Design a protein around this ligand. Structure first.
Ligand code: FMN
Ligand code: FMN
Lengths: 166, 167
């Protein structure tokens, strides 16, 4: 169900995400596959609404943060990268696990892209005073959904399937 | 439902073919992934020909799982579908993760075989399938019924990775 029903939800109720749910989101992230099992992820968890609202300024497409009770900033540590070529993929897998787990827990979430847009990456580095080795990846805003639902939109397209050869 | 915890990289498979219905479900799962701009840039080559699958193992030094796999899915992205080309690898990674999770859900084993951005691997996949310039190899996923490995929970949680409010 969660693969079909997971949606980008950008509008939230007032109430906080339970600490037990926050932990489950982070556990889900850390179960992602990673190149070389390098597990390069670090996470900043925000519940301070003043700071979440400020964080909404990191990009032009991050307005969901203005009502979010929770934000999770996904970062990768260069020093942990055995296979630096594929760190974005590791982080994307972790992000997708968070999104799916959020839907499982009846939460709404949306992936707010950062890497590799320089102005976004720079904003996140500055906002969190990040060391040179700590690379911003994305922000996930999370809350209980307002009006929007985790409901199935059927995106299947058989034209994307090539049998044996392109 | 414990699929996020139990999904493992499975690199050795039984000879049993993956049922047509399960193949379709894997591809459906891929296509439900989020994507920047909703650009949905993905294309898939599905292989069940064992000679072609074995040949495909040569694309990388880390693709030996294909030598026993009854199914391979090559993930590709089309430049001409990209509205936000800066993020296409992320879209494709989300699709790959959906495949892997759906595989575990269906009692299958799978492993992500990285390609992009390793030039030799991408070049080998382009050549093997004679791809158009705009069709970019992303990865290969080998899939089958597990031989001597399991989808089981290896707990990778590390609380030191969690920073509260600030780094
Ligand atoms: C981007 C990426 C590329 C990967 N490439 C390979 C690969 O080429 N060959 C391989 O055997 N495993 C590959 N893996 C699988 C990882 O080695 C595996 O996820 C890691 O060892 C953790 O084990 P798990 O998947 O069981 O959690 C890749 C994983 C990721 C996310
Ligand atoms: C790499 C990536 C970056 C994204 N960046 C943003 C973003 O900055 N702001 C936003 O509102 N949504 C963002 N999204 C969410 C997409 O717009 C969304 O996945 C797409 O419209 C499909 O809708 P769905 O998630 O409901 O399936 C991003 C998604 C991906 C995978």
């Amino acid at each position: 169900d969660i693969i079909n029903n997971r949606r980008s939800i950008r509008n939230y109720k007032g109430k906080k995400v339970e600490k037990e749910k926050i932990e489950k989101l982070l556990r889900a992230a850390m179960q992602a596959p990673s190149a070389g099992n390098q597990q390069p992820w670090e996470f900043i968890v925000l519940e301070d609404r003043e700071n979440i609202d400020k964080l909404s300024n990191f990009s032009k497409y991050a307005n969901s943060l203005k009502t979010a009770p929770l934000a999770i900033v996904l970062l990768a540590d260069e020093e942990k990268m055995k296979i630096s070529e594929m760190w974005e993929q590791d982080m994307a897998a972790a992000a997708e696990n968070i999104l799916l787990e959020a839907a499982y827990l009846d939460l709404g979430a949306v992936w707010l892209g950062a890497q590799p847009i320089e102005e976004r990456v720079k904003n996140l580095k500055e906002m969190f005073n990040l060391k040179s080795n700590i690379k911003p990846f994305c922000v996930i805003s999370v809350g209980y959904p307002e009006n929007s639902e985790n409901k199935f939109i059927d995106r299947f397209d058989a034209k994307r399937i090539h049998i044996e050869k392109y």
